[PDB]
Design a protein around this ligand. Structure first.
Ligand SMILES: [Pd+2]
Ligand SMILES: [Pd+2]
Ligand SMILES: [Pd+2]
Ligand SMILES: [Pd+2]
Ligand SMILES: [Pd+2]
Ligand SMILES: [Pd+2]
Ligand SMILES: [Pd+2]
Ligand SMILES: [Pd+2]
Ligand SMILES: [Pd+2]
Ligand SMILES: [Pd+2]
Ligand SMILES: [Pd+2]
Ligand SMILES: [Pd+2]
Ligand SMILES: [Pd+2]
Ligand SMILES: [Pd+2]
Ligand SMILES: [Pd+2]
Ligand SMILES: [Pd+2]
Ligand SMILES: [Pd+2]
Ligand SMILES: [Pd+2]
Ligand SMILES: [Pd+2]
Ligand SMILES: [Pd+2]
Ligand SMILES: [Pd+2]
Ligand SMILES: [Pd+2]
Ligand SMILES: [Pd+2]
Ligand SMILES: [Pd+2]
Ligand SMILES: [Pd+2]
Ligand SMILES: [Pd+2]
Ligand SMILES: [Pd+2]
Ligand SMILES: [Pd+2]
Ligand SMILES: [Pd+2]
Ligand SMILES: [Pd+2]
Ligand SMILES: [Pd+2]
Ligand SMILES: [Pd+2]
Ligand SMILES: [Pd+2]
Ligand SMILES: [Pd+2]
Lengths: 172, 172, 172, 172
């Protein structure tokens, strides 16, 4: 009703879904974090790497909402799906689930930049690049590096490898 | 399987529900915060009072989970219901919805302390008192005080009252 | 004649017009500022909010010219139209005239980014995004917020509302 | 004979036994500490983690006695049973014996809070909660976490695992 200019309804709706994907990502990381803090799991380095993660993904969603408000859009919130798992297995399984997760957020950012361009919205561009696409590429680089390291501490000594990985790379 | 001692399954389950109630409260406050930041609402003092709120309720849920982990319990997460409203009306409506909200969290804390006592769990007691019941009583006091003030800037000059309330009590 | 590379004549000309639109905006804000400093208007908070404004819009035009020089373009200056009004009415009227003004600058920035893309000029992109489109979106957000507040101090007590708005939001 | 008020003889006696259980725990940890300092055992990280332990359990017993004096009770001391073992085996065996030990102290604290409530002694409550039950829950969490880690450095490489555990988690 007042400051909205060159901010289409389809972008608005896609921004709304992206906030939902970020908060769900936040929620996943929170679950991942408390899982590795369990007394029969107990890997503190892995718990805080995920905490953290949950914060980043939560700041992602906040940065989006505020942007949405800046353009005269309207935040609409939906239910947050619970994380896809209750137990997360080993640091390896967990780090796979995170990369799957960040890859899908990256894809959603790309699907939305492709919408920005097709909607003559050069400023969204721009906001997504300067603020999201970059972090996302670095992060996925960092997780891939971790995965490569866990995978090399592979076999036949799974317990020792996780212990050392968590002691020597994750802690903190 | 290891450190769990005098931590019943019913307490575990009730702790799980309480984390869910706290995160839903967090989510509500996030919605409330971005609502008052809209360009056709624009009350910054009210937006940050809610931000804040969302943090506190999120720290509440974290303090519970960590406790749950300390006792050898197991965090179980469920879907988070979206906030009960998409638009929150005036500062008055919003501050009513918050008190309704904090009252129901307080009741859930009480229902759980009544379970702690009936489950011979003197330590939960204790954790809930030293950490939750108190904040909750102060907070509800602070909101009631606000409500009494908004209600006195009542009629016939609604716009002026909200402006002054937000300038003189809420900002910041 | 020397460093110019991938800088079309149509972009040059549009950059020239945009500098003119920015300086005219500067001039408008200068008039707005001295108006509210008149002894029969006398609202100091509103005078310096506009001063300020005039500076920003003047830095906008300078940033454009220097860019134009960097690309080997040639600054061409035209007459500056006097502001559209000699008296600016109330803070409300004035804040409407400013938003109309900043909206039209934003549109001109967009018309020029659409030209940058259609002229295979990825660097202008880029310069406009990193430096102009963003400030413009924040600013229009800030003015819209003001307008919403003035409009809520609406009726029947116009004098009191402006006084309080200027005391409690604009000052300084 | 003077300040004693609402402090039953059965509580007095149970407090006396609890001091004895704490000092015996202190004594156990002292033995555990000097065992791992033996030249054919030689694990310094494990020796100081137990020293420490012995101090905490000794401060536990002191905090109880002083409380007992505050209420007008009378400290009665009994013989201290020697620790249940002369050699403590591996860090794993030792960390099992400690958890068994702290669990039984926790149970005794609970048996005594159940006595406090059944003796209309709201202040003991209270003293046990604010000062003992909590430390005990954290500590058992910390030991369980250790055990889970030792158990994962399990097989077939017992020597390496203890060395690394002691180097990377216990030291110091
Ligand atoms: Pd609007
Ligand atoms: Pd943790
Ligand atoms: Pd950490
Ligand atoms: Pd952690
Ligand atoms: Pd941490
Ligand atoms: Pd933006
Ligand atoms: Pd882009
Ligand atoms: Pd671009
Ligand atoms: Pd860290
Ligand atoms: Pd367990
Ligand atoms: Pd805000
Ligand atoms: Pd604030
Ligand atoms: Pd705010
Ligand atoms: Pd704020
Ligand atoms: Pd606890
Ligand atoms: Pd209690
Ligand atoms: Pd109590
Ligand atoms: Pd604040
Ligand atoms: Pd040249
Ligand atoms: Pd002035
Ligand atoms: Pd000023
Ligand atoms: Pd001024
Ligand atoms: Pd000034
Ligand atoms: Pd440039
Ligand atoms: Pd661009
Ligand atoms: Pd200023
Ligand atoms: Pd006495
Ligand atoms: Pd030693
Ligand atoms: Pd040590
Ligand atoms: Pd030592
Ligand atoms: Pd030492
Ligand atoms: Pd006492
Ligand atoms: Pd108690
Ligand atoms: Pd130490």
């Amino acid at each position: 009703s007042q400051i909205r200019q060159n901010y289409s309804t389809e972008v608005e709706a896609a921004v709304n879904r992206l906030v939902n994907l970020y908060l769900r990502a936040s929620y996943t990381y929170l679950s991942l974090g408390f899982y590795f803090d369990r007394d029969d799991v107990a890997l503190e380095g892995v718990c805080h790497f995920f905490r953290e993660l949950a914060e980043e993904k939560r700041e992602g969603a906040e940065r989006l909402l505020k942007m949405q408000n800046q353009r005269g859009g309207r935040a609409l919130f939906q239910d947050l799906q619970k994380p896809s798992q209750d137990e997360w297995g080993t640091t390896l399984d967990a780090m796979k689930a995170a990369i799957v997760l960040e890859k899908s957020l990256n894809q959603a950012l790309l699907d939305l930049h492709a919408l920005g361009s097709a909607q003559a919205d050069p400023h969204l561009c721009d906001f997504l690049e300067s603020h999201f696409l970059d972090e996302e590429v670095k992060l996925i680089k960092k997780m891939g590096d971790h995965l490569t390291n866990i995978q090399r501490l592979v076999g036949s000594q799974a317990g020792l490898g996780e212990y050392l990985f968590e002691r020597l790379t994750l802690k903190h």
